[PDB]
Each structure stands twice: as C-alpha cells, then as structure tokens.
Amino acid sequence: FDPALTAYVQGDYSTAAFWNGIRCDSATAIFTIGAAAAAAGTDLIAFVQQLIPRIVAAGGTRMWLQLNTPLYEVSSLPDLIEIDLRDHVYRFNGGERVEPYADPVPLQQ
Amino acid sequence: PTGKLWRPVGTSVATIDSLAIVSDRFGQYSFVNEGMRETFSKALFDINMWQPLFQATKTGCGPIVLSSFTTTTSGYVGATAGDALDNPVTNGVFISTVQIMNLQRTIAARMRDVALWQKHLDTAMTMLTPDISAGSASCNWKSLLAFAKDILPLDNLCLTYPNEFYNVAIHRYPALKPGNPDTKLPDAQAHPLGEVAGAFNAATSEVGSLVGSSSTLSQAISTMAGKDLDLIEADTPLPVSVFTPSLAPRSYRPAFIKPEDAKWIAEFNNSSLIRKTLTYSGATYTVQLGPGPTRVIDMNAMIDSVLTLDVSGTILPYDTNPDLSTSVPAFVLIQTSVPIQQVTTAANITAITVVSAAGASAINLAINVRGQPRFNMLHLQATFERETITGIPYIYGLGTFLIPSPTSSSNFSNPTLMDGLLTVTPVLLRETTYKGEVVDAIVPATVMANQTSEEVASALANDAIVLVSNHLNKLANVVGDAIPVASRTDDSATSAIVSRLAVQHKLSQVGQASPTPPDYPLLWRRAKRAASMFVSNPSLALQVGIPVLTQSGMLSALTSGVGTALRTGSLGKGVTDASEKLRARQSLTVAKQAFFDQIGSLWP
Amino acid sequence: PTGKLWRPVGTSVATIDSLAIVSDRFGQYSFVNEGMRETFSKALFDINMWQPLFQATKTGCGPIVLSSFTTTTSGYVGATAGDALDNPVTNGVFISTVQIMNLQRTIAARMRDVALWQKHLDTAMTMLTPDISAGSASCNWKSLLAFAKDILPLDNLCLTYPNEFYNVAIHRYPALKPGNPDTKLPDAQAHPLGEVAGAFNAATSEVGSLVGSSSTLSQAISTMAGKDLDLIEADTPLPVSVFTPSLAPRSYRPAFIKPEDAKWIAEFNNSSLIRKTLTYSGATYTVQLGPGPTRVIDMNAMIDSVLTLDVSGTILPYDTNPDLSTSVPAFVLIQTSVPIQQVTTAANITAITVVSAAGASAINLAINVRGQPRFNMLHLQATFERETITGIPYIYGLGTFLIPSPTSSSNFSNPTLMDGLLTVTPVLLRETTYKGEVVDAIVPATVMANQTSEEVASALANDAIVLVSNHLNKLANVVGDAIPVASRTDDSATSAIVSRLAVQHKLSQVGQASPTPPDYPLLWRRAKRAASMFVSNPSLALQVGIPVLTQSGMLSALTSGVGTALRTGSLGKGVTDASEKLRARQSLTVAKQAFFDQIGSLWP
Amino acid sequence: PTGKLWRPVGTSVATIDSLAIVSDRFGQYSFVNEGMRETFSKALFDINMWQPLFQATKTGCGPIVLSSFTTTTSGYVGATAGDALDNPVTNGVFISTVQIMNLQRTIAARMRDVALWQKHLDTAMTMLTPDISAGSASCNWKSLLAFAKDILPLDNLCLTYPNEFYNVAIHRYPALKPGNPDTKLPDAQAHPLGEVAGAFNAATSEVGSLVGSSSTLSQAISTMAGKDLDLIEADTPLPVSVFTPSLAPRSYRPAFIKPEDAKWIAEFNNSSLIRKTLTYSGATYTVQLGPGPTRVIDMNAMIDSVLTLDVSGTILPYDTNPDLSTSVPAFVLIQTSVPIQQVTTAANITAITVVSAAGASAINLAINVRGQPRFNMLHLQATFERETITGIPYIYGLGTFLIPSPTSSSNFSNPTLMDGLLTVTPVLLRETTYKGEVVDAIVPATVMANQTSEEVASALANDAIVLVSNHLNKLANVVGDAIPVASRTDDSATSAIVSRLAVQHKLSQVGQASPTPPDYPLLWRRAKRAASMFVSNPSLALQVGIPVLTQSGMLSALTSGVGTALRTGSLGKGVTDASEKLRARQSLTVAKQAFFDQIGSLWP
Amino acid sequence: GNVQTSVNTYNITGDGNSFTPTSDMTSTAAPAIDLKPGVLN
Amino acid sequence: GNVQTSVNTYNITGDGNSFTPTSDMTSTAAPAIDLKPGVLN
Ligand SMILES: *C(=O)CCCCCCCCCCCCC
C-alpha cells in the first residue's frame, strides 16, 4: 500500500506510550474499545475517560466507538449477550468473551 | 587506452622507439576513452536542453554534437612510446588539441549564455517550490500561471518567452507536465530529460534518499582515510605533519593557569616583593612581581610563536594606589639566574628586557565604566623565537606593568597584566610541545588519559594535547556523522567497544571463584554511553579518570571499527528512522499542498 | 557485468545452480568492467609519465601496461550463481586475485618511486608559479633556468637530472613548451599529457571555472541530502539521531541565566539566608544560599551529562569577609523537600551532598592580580546521571562555597561560585531536552520562533534548541555557499520566500475594500533581506519576533527551494560576477608578468 | 549518446524535425550509456550479494538482473531532435520510464530489506575489528565464534542465521576465509566480492593509502576552485558575493574598543558630564555620558544589522551610588548636532531615542554574587537600518543606563552598559563595510597588512577585514590539509614564497657594491616559516608589520603555487612520513593481535 | 502567455497542462558534472 | 551454529574456517555509489 495513504502502527492504544506522534483528525474504535476495557481489566467509563482525551490531543475532530451500553433497555439476549448486573459486564455468547459496559446516562454525561 | 595517440614514425614496424606522438597542424590527437565522452556528452547534453531558448533569442548556433570536435584516427595510444605500444587502437575517436580548445571555449561560451537564462527560469520555478518529497500534490495550472504573471519582477526573462522557457523548463521539472496536443490531457508520468537522475533523488520512503545516504558515507570514508583517523591512538613517534595542524592559534588567561596544570607557565612564588629596575627608553621603571605568586609564561617550552597578550576590559585600579597610574603596561622578558620557583630576591634576576611596551602611562589607557576604570583594548606583543633563548636556562615572559616609581600603595597590588586574554599562535608548525618539552613527533597513545580535567583546557596552541584533540575531533565527526551513535541501535562504534569490555572484564574474572558471569545487557549499555560520550565530547578521552574511554584498548579499537563500518554502509543506511523521517516528509507535503490550494484560490 | 566470473561446474548446461566461482591456482578472476579499467589505466598513465626519470635512475622496470595483469577468460560473470547467469560474457577481460595483488603493489611501489621525484620536480616548478588565469605571460627561458640554477637547494633532484625531469615536467606544465628540434622554435599550443583535464580547469573567462562551480554545487547537493536539511522545519516527532549531534559540549555562566530564560536552572528566591550544614570529610561546613537569589542548575531536565564548573579568574573576596577564606569551594547537589522557589528555610532542604569538593581552603586557590584576589583556574566537576535522581522530585546542582564557619561578614556575600564558566557536555546523545523535559524526539517546527532573544543563547548543550540550531546552520552554509543570497540577484532562496509573502499578504487582503493591491518590488526586497538575514545568522529563525523568517511557511519553504535550486545550478553558475572576477584575474596576471620580468633581468 | 531515444515520426528520412521522442504506453525510453549501467549494476551487485539471506528469510524474489528493466530498441538518441540526429544507435539498451520506476523502487525496497540485516551482520562483524592495516594476525575461529555466541545481544539476526549471514559476510570481510570443503583447510587468498576495491584500500606500506591521499587532494582541489581561493589577494573591486559570507555574526565588548582601532565606534571625549533628558514612557530619564569617554557605536558605518547588546555578569554598583539603582538600563540612539568628538554639552545633542529599554529598574536585574551585584543575563537589542539614519550626519548607538534622577553619587560612575558583550549580526549580506564606509565590493590586496594588531580583532561582523579573513581561512585549510607546510620538506607552498624573496632581495642588491650575494639556505628557511606562519594563523597577513607575509608579492604568489601544487599531487602524496606512519600501523596490529590472543584463550 | 505556435512543441497557456509535483521524480538537471584532473583524465 | 547443509556453500561451524585479517585486503562492500544529478546523468 502507498505509505502516504495507509499507515500501520503496532502496540495497543490502551497504553499511554503509543500516543506519541500519532495525529489523525478522526479516530474510530469499533470492535476494540470493549476488549480494551476488559484486557486492561478496567471500568468501561474510566477507560474511555482516558481514551477520548487522547483522541482530542491526537488532534481529532470526529470519533466513532463501538461502545457496549444498554441505551434502549437493560434487557438482554438469551444466547447472544448476557448482562451481568452485579458487575457492569457483558457475556457475548456467555463466556466466549467478557467485556465491561457503561450505562446510557452515566456514560453519556 | 588513454593519452595522446602515437604512430610509427619509422613506418610499418612499430617498436618502442619507432613511435612518436602523432602531432601536426591541429595539435596532438589525444584519445577520448569511453568515460571521458560521458562527461563532454553530459555537458553538451545539459546545453542542448536549452535549445528552445537559443533559437528564440537568435544566439547559439544549432545543437552542439560532440561528434563535431572529434575524429576517427587510428594508431597506438599511450602515455609514452613504451606503453603506447600496447594499445593498438583502430579508428578510435580522438580530439585534436586545437579541438580540445573549442569543445572547451564552446561549452564555456554556451555555458554563459544558458547560465544566464537558466537563472531567470529559476527565480520563477523555485518561486513555487516544484519539489515535494512524500506523495503528490497539484495546483491547478491556470491559477499558478496567472499568479506568477504577478510576482515575477519586470526584468526576468520568463515573461518575455513564457513558452520558450516553459519548453526548457518541462525538461528540468518533472512537476510541470505539459498537456498532450492530441487528447488535450496531462500524461501521469512526467518525462524530464533527467529521467533517471531525477528518479534516483526522490526521497524513497523505504530509505531516506539514496543520493544522500550514499554521499554521507563516501564523505566520511574520505576523512577516515584522509586526515589519518586510522592510527588515532597509535603508540609510537609520529611527525606533527601527520596531524596537518593548521589555522591553530589558541588564546588563554594566565596569571590564573596553575603551573602544574600546564608546564609552559612557571610562577615566582616568593615571600616578599621583588622590585627590580631597568632603564627603558631612558626613564627607569620598576618591574614588581608583587604580593601574589605572579604566574609568568616560561620561555623554554614555548614553540617560537607569536605571543600577543591583550589587556582590555580588565580592571586598572590607578584610582586607589596612585602608584599604578603613570606606569606604561608592557610585556617584558625576565632572565633569572637561579631557576624561578627558587628565585628569592632582586639580585637573583639576571636582566629584564621590555620586549614590547605600551606608549603612554596608565591614565590614557584607562576608560571609566562605572567607577572601576578598565583598560582600553590594546595588544602588547612579542615574537618569541626558540633560539633567541639559546643557553639561557631560565627566562620568562611576563606581561607586567613597569611602574615609574614603586610606593607603599602598590605593596599589595601586584601589577601582572596577565589576567588579560593572551593569544599565542605557533609560528612554525613543524615543532610541537609536550609536557614542557619541544618535539617533532608525538606518541598519541601517550597523550590519552594523561592530562587532567584542566591539563587539557590549559593546553598550549599546537602542542601534543591540542593536536591529539584536533585529531579525535575529526574522528568524532565521522562517527557523529556516518555511524548512528545516537540511537538505541548498538551501532558498529559502540559495538567495537563492547567487545573490548567483554574480553577485558572476562579475563579479570579468570582465576578466583569467578562468582560473576559477565553481564552483557549491562556491558552493551555501558559501552554505548562510552562510544556516545566520545562522539559527544571527543576531548574527554585525554583526561585521567574517564570510564571505559581511557583504557588503552578503546579508540584504537573504536576507530578501526568505525573504519570498516563506513566501508560497508551499503547505500540504504538511511533506513534508520526512515519511518518518522518519512512521516515528517508527508507532513510537509500536506502543508505545502495547503499552500498550492491558496495560490489556486486567490489568483483564480 | 561485474563481480567474479563463474563457469558451469556441471558442464555445458548452465542452470543458475551449475555455475560456481571459477577459482584456481591464481585466485578468482573478477571481471574488469569498462569504467574500472579507466581507473587502473588513469593510475598507470600517471606513472608511465615518469618514464624518463625511471630509466635515468635505473629503478622502475619498463612501462606498466595494464594488459599485463589481466586475461581473456570467458564465462558468466555476476555476484551470485543466480544473477551471474544473466551476464554471459565471451573473452571478457578479468584480473585474477593474485594479479589484483600486483597491479596493486606495483602501482604502490611505483607510486612511492614517483611520489618522491615528483616532489622535487615540484619545489622547483611551483617555485616560479607556472600558472596564471587570465591572458598569457612569458619569461625568457635562459634567465628562468639560470635563476633556478640558484634558488633550488643542493638536495633537490632537478639539479642532478635537468632534462630528465624537464621531460617529465613538459607533460605536466603546459607552461613549459619545449623548443621543437627541426625549426628550433616553440609550438604556440602546449601538449601536456593532461591535454583535456588541463583545458577544462583553466579559469574560462565566460564563467569562473567549470571545475570549481561544478563541485561547489555537487558539494552543496551532498549536504542537502545528507545531514537532512530537507525536512528542516518538519512539524512532527523526529529522533535526535536524525540530527547527528556530535562534538557538542556548550559552556555557560549561570548565577546569571534567568530561570525563565532556560528551564534547566531554578533559583532559591527567598527572603533571608538559608544556612544549612553537612559533615563532609569529618569537618562540618555550612552551605550558604546567601542574600541574592542564587540560581542553581536544576537536576531534573539535565540529560545525564558531564557538568564541569570551572571557577577561575573570578573574584574571591576573602580579603574583606574573612569568613569566605578557609572554605573549600565545591560543587554540591541539594535535595529539597518542598519544590525550590518555595523553599524558605533550612528545615526545607532534605539533604546536601558534596559531589565534588576542592581540596585546600579559599586562601591557596587565590592569587593576587591587583588587590582583587582571583581564583587559580581549577575545575570542580560532577557526572550527573538521569536515574541517580529517580523519584527525587526536587534536587539542584549548586557550585557553592562550603564555609567552615558562617559569620556576620558573610551576611551579604552569597558564595555561589556559579559566576564561573560552567561547561555541560551531554554524555548520552540519544536523549535531548526541551522546555525543561527530557525527550527522544524533537518537533522542529515547534522550536521555530518559540525561544526568546536569550532563550537561545541560554540553551543547554544538546537540547532541541541547540539541535534545531546545528541543523539550520548546515542549511545556512548550503545557501551561503551554493546559492547567491548575497547580491541583487533575487536568487532561488529569496525567491521561494517572496512567493510565500505574496500568497500570504494576498489572502490577508481578501475580504474588506482590498484598497491595497500587493506591492512586489517591496515584497521582493523584503524577502531578499529575510532570506539574507537567515544565511547571515541562521539562529534568529528561533527567536519570537523576527520579521518574515518566523512565519510557519518560510524555511520549510526556503529549504525545499534551495533544494531544487542546487539540483539545476547547470555548471556555469560561476557566471555570477564572472566579470569583476575575470577582471581581477587579469589584474593578477599583469602583476605576475611583472615578476617574470625581473626574473628575466636580474638573472640574465 | 545520452538522453531519451527519438525516432522518425514522418518515417524513413530522419531529419532535424521528422524526429520525435519515441514515447508510448511505457513512458519514454531513455538511453542507458555505458557508465550509467555501471551504477545500476554496482547497486544491484551490492544487493545480489545478500542472496543467502533473502532465501533464508523467504523475502526478496530471486536475484535482480539489470537486464530485466531495460530493452533493445534502436533509433536516434539525443537531448533534442536537432542533436539526437547525430547519435544513430542500433539496438542500444534503453530503460523505459515506467521501468526507470521499478529499477528505482526495487533497489529501494530491497535496499531497505538488506539495510536492516546488513546492520545486524555489522554489530557482530565490527564487534571484533576484522580490519588491521599492517602485516596479518589471526584468531583461532572456534574461540571467536564461541565468543560472539555470547556478546551478541539476543535481538541481533546473526544468531538466528549464523551460516546464512556468514555466507553474506564472507563476501564483505576478506578477514573471514571459509574453509574449503574438499581439503578442509583455508585458502591463503581471501575472495570477497569487493576483490579490487578492498585491495585498493589496504593501507599500502609504500604510501599511506591511495584512497586517502587521493581524496585529501581532490577535496582540496574542490575548495581551491570553489570558494575562489585563487584570486585571494587580487587588487581590484570584488562583489561581496564573491566571498560567500554566511553564518557570520561576530560579537564584541565596546566601551573598550579604541575609536581609531575600528572606525565603526566613536567616543564622546568631553571635559565634564553631559546629562541630557528624554520623556520615555511618560517618566523622564537622564542619559549620562559620564566622566570617562563613553565609546558609542557609530550609526553611520554600521551595515543595517541586528545589534544585540547583552548586559550580563557585568558589575552593577547600585550598592554605592544609589543613583544607579532605579534606572532601567536601555540601548538608546543619540543624534547630535555637531559631530561627536566635538560635542561638548547637552545643547549639542539633538535628540535621544530609547530604541529598546529594559522593563524594571536596576534592582531586579541585579543578583548578588559575593558583594558585587551582577546583571541577570538579559539582551537589549535594536535593529539598525542603513536608511532609517538617512541625512542625519551624526547619530550613535549607545547602550547606556537612563537614570531616573542624576545625583552627586553618579558623578564619577558613567553608566555605559557597553562593557557588556554586544553581538552585531549583519542582516543584509550584499553590503560590506571598510575603514568606516559601506560598500558593495572589496579590493582584497588593500586589506592586506593594512589593519593593526587589533584593527583586526576589532573588525565588524561582515566587513572587508572579516571577509578577507574568512577567505584566507579557507586557503589556509587547503594548504594546512593537502600541502605539507608542517615538515622540513620545503613544499610547494613555502617554495612559491622563496622564489619571491630571492627575486626581491636580488634586485634590492642591484646597484651599489653588491657585497652580499643572496643567501638561499637562509631564504629557504625564512620563507618556510613565512608560509608556515600563514597556515598557522591565516589572519596575520592583514596586520601591518609581519615579516615576508605582508609584502604584495606573497599570497597572491602563495595561493597560485598551492594551486598548481594540488593539481599534481599524483596519488601517492601519502609517501610523506609514510615510514613512521607505517611503523605506527604495525604497532597497532601488534596490539590488536594481542587482543585476538585473549579472545582465543578466555573463550576456548 | 500569448500564443506562440511552433517555436517549441508546447504552448504554455496550452490546453490541459498541469503543475503537479510528485515526491517520486525530484526535478534536477546536471550540476555535479565531474571535471577534476584525475577524474576527467 | 547448528549445521545447515546446503542453503549456503559454507557452514559457519564448518571444517577448517579461519578468521584472519590481512593488512592487505581491507574489507569493504559498496557504500560510495555515485548518484548525484550530474554524475548519474
Ligand atoms: C505570458 O507570458 C503570461 C505569463 C505566464 C508565464 C510567464 C512566466 C511564469 C511561468 C513560468 C513558466 C515556465 C517555467 C516557470
């Protein structure tokens, strides 16, 4: 791929280091943002709390993040996603992967 | 073959004597070997390019074919009958002397012609940076033109011939792609006459730039072999010449330099004062050698130089001790009987010569700068000469005061004007100085870790130390330049050293419990800062007490590494950090594209 | 083709695997491509020239034909079986290893032989400047000879073989034209073996000198691609390595540098004094932090260097406050609890380490230089290391005094020895420093017009500023050198800038009455001094408040102009002022003709 | 031939118009002249070498034959229809544009690939200096290997492919000789792909190193023609441009420089004080022009620069005369009616402009450094401009104090802050300055032996003197470098001068008893130190009163000698002291053999 | 920019021209021609 | 140093190899390839 048009950076964005010298006017964290909160074993709200500000500094005008919050209802799917309420977390295929979530209102504000 | 062509003057049989430079009415035909045609073709090629501007302006005279200055003679072509006999060339292409004259004055006359136009084309071309180094970036032609229609000052030549310069231009800037006549659209590819050269200069994103990284290497290789960086810590007599010491006149501030910190400067450390006298220009003055030790430039161990002691801006307290005023400051030699540092009183000082006094007492040389009267910048100055001090075991140069009448006021003054910035300039390179002696050869390795912190900064202009510093300094710029001694890349330099530390720390572990298996991650890192500390401040490697750097191995080691390291760089050495370097170039082209965007709007 | 020659070891069919380096009893035949014969011929050619001196002195052994070291083998010649398969060469000319040895040691042995004679021929040749650069000028031969018959010292070799050296000479100096045997008159033309080369070096009056102007360009082109002048104001992280910082140890004078003028140096601005204590070598001393603010080197933001604070020639008033004498001056670190600039009294200062004291009190380090006792030049010196200060939020390096007993006398003294010339030397290039922080990459564009007048001169040896200054400095010598930024020629440099000023001043006029149509004669001239002010003092482009130069466009602009500008100079760039330059050369030849006229009379 | 290939678009008959660049779907075929194939072959050759590492790591794609990017077209090949008509080439080898693209990006992509590995091979290779320069020296292979098995850090690539790197290596280091398979013993000779190049770099004992001595010459030749060292003492107007003055901002210390020692600085030598007033920012201050002469920078004869007077570390006695404190120090222009040096009292001073004051009085700018309060390093600074002083016959720049209330205390103070280190930086190169006037051309010969000791060190940044010093300085490094002006070899340089002294001393003997036949042994030696004193301190040749060096002949003479001297060095110039140089290299190889001996034992 | 017509194969104000730098072809004529003594012969 | 066998004509740990510098052949490859405008063409 033409270097000018496509660039590739290794290492996670969850770690503060990675953000040195990476400026893009728009970021998209779809399919990852949920796994990072789980990988970094951190709270979902607290996670994006440190990511959003990095994208601002990274020089970003737009953002798209596939966050997993029950905005419509706290109701879950029997086989697709279980919503453990004791601890804000999901269970895509109950176990196959577990990723913390936020609430529509708290995460919104 | 090469050289002038010869032919059998004795006919037929061509032996090593029946030859003779085939000269004649045109001069002597000298052979034009394959490569030498590359030049004259490359030179003429760069002129033919300007064809459209030669016709436009009725100068020139048609395209210059190199085949108009040569011929097709045949004979034996060498440098001398003997060796020319082994180069029988048939119908070779030779250029006669009188021709070697025109191809010369033509390329010269035409070169002026174009050099001029070529200058106008430029103030207009570069006047819109037609060169980016990452990705592309256009700028709608209409605007561009209608824009330069402005900027370009009324005396260019790109306004008198637009598409007479444009046609010359298209062949030099693969940025301007002319619109094809029968499809009225660009071409994607740009075909400038410098097709290849221009392709091989683009900053290729894989590795910086071949033309760059290539030279930065051959450049370093030049130095490495040239100055003689190799052999930098050689342990054996070396003629000062081997150090090409030039443009080397260092300046100080004595009367401060401790005697042990630099052999070429002894001091009169005596109890009381040593007032002496001397009839200078009739008037009798008294040299003082006041209260303090009064450090004086020793004369032996002083390579016949040009000592020029400047005394300016320095205090001149004629305000208090009136004794000081009236005394003409002057650099004076002092021959003592008993060796200095053993010279107690006046009767000890053989004689005193005023090698250079300052006309007018100390009250005209002054200048008030807020109470504390300073010294109007003036330079006293001897011209010491090795032998003018022959035999004379003890003699010292002293830039003192010459008081016309010593008094009680000047009983704690001590008129040494040495606090001034003295500037010795070795006037006879062949002879160097070391540890106080004058020599003709140094022993490099000896001067390493043998000076002290300041037994270096106090070195005497063109003395071993200053020479074994001017040398490391070259080798320091070869590594600093070519080798990457400034990144975590454990380069060839910091690598040559690591192997020494190992082999060293490894045998120091031999015999006894060997409880410590060599480290390596710690050794690599220790030698990295060692090679790094060197590139940093080349000097250090002379000071006693510097970690790693001052062990006999290193340096002798380093250089010979850095040596082979340059002789293999490849071409794509620029691959180092060629990532951020690339990303920075795209950064610029994005900002330059931003410029073209305005040129594109403002001037629609 | 190139490389060693290979041949089908498996016979007949060559499959790219069958081929093997055809080695043998002579070593391996390596192919001698066309150009590589140019060198060995050009080398041997320069030796054959000395034929008349080899016979005269019975050394040598006949003319060296390059056709004596080669052969006429044939096979496939490449660098590896795979690629050698695509270079079937028949009866090519290869030189076997053992031969590549002689052609080497022969050219070496002979090279010595001639290098010697060639040196004698010279002290005699140049001993009458056989080279003028405008018009001609003779010197009746009789005189000339009868003259050198004198001057030449009795140990030359031009007196033992006159016309054995003369014959060698005639081929190197187209000045000496031998008188033809059968017409007993000169030749007008001069035929020296270097026929062409010597023709193309003459200072052609149309344009300075092709050999000069050509190189001064390729030279600049080297740098432009090399160091990485391109990308000089790139706006994005760049490894310090990309700046090849070497031989970089800058020195100062703190205790003067304002804290805000350079982050790496904070001060104890507190009301009263802060006398602390510390047992150093048994004896208890008191660090003072006297009356004034006492600016101290901060430790954080201090790239593990080699701090060497020199204290010499600086005042040492032990005369008044006797308190000062007896105290050994010493560089000492000071860890404070509360951040400095908030550290009020002694209980605040955690601890104080004497990182390097000076043996012997302040009354042996002195030296009277007219009342005001100075400091005998001595260098205290720590070796600060990034991590030896890990965690420790506050710590400062201070070159103070360590008084053995504080008194009323030292109540307004303030013993900071920082007034001395401190010299920090970054000992670990990889890490730079900016605005007070230690980093591994700079952002060039950030450091432009971001420092103040003195936020530059106060930079810390190998810090962004000092790096973004060492860089501009190269680019400053490429323009200064190649481009004509020093004449009314509105060059490519001052031209790149003019286009920015226009595009800039043009949009600032857009929207609103546009009552001012851009100037241009005024813009050209404003940008001319802008590009000129840059070449002049490269640094300025870092200081906030510099006209033009400090706008983001320029520089990023300039360089990329100067860039393409060098890649087109032509060859006859020397046409610039090649008029007065010419007229000056004729001026010299007229004066040199005047010399030959005396050689011609005195020695008739 | 050269350039793109053309073909008769009109068919058959090819005239100077029936041609046309044969472009097409591939771009334009540009001819690949003999030498240009040497490069692309030499580039590909260096890549093929790494064949064994490309397969090992599945990258690459087979060996790159240059015959895959070219073609065998035929037509006329020139730079323009006109001249291309004289180069009918049949079945020449051209490379199409789109191909000139791959051979480019391939050599670039592959270049990265190898540049990386090639870096690992190195940290391991140079990590045991495989290069000596005198005699041989082995190191039993087992040990060597078993040793690097250690040192080499776990992230190299020489541990993952030992004999996949080894095979690449064997071709770059003629040190590693692989053991032949069918006799299981070395080879004596070493056959690395760089067979010839590596043979011609060895430090040949006859003469240092051909690759070195060769370049150190061509290097000097470049400069000699480039800067324009030739014509160094030309007696006739020369545009400042001809001196390529760049990066040239010199700093001083006025209020010390005598007015006659440097025209650009006059002084108010008047009896009493000249207290004037001026409303600056409302508040009324009094400029002093105190007790002493107060030397001020004159404005005329001041090339529109960037004057930046720094006032730091310099005394500030607000302690005594309280009058001084409260006054904001500030650089101020002073227009006087009657010419200075004739300006007696206040009514004489036309006006006074505060071109740049320092906010905050003299009691915040201070900082106590042992009693004597100094000046916190700060830079006041004007931007003088040629014409802002049009008409105005008398005007002077003065960095004074601006006292808010003159008193009896400041009656002997004289607040000139000029004792500070002022740094003028010419901001407009085109215009120089000489003897007090601003010009556009110098007359070199005029500036020789025309300045005094300090009429040189007091020169004004970018003034004839400083230009006729920057010039000699280049010529000083060409001799210092190439020519051996630092040994008893009566070199070409000291030889050109000797011939002048003779011709000179010889006619001064003509007429009168001629009782003294010229010396010569004494003349050779006198001119040797003359040429030597020059290389030493190039400057001197400007100062009135320097033996030999300052007579009109020399220099004009010297250079033109040194000139031809470089254009003949031969190649084996290194034969100079190539004896001790050799003996020193053997000295190193003996010590390095000593190293291999331990590598050989410790790691058995 | 006034129309010319044949003097040179391209008009400047000609139809569909196009200023457009490409990091790929860095514009360059022939400045570094080697002429030094040893290298020119 | 583990035995390979054919990938490359020489084994590293192979029989009778020999590190042994000779002042005669200064190791390396090809760094100074000329590419500057005038000189490359
Ligand atoms: C007619 O001449 C109008 C002006 C348009 C071109 C004049 C010169 C400016 C553009 C240069 C084109 C050739 C290379 C810069």
Ligand SMILES: *C(=O)CCCCCCCCCCCCC
């Ligand atoms: C097996 O790989 C054991 C290690 C022996 C060689 C590893 C690399 C060190 C020697 C390098 C040989 C090739 C050129 C240095």
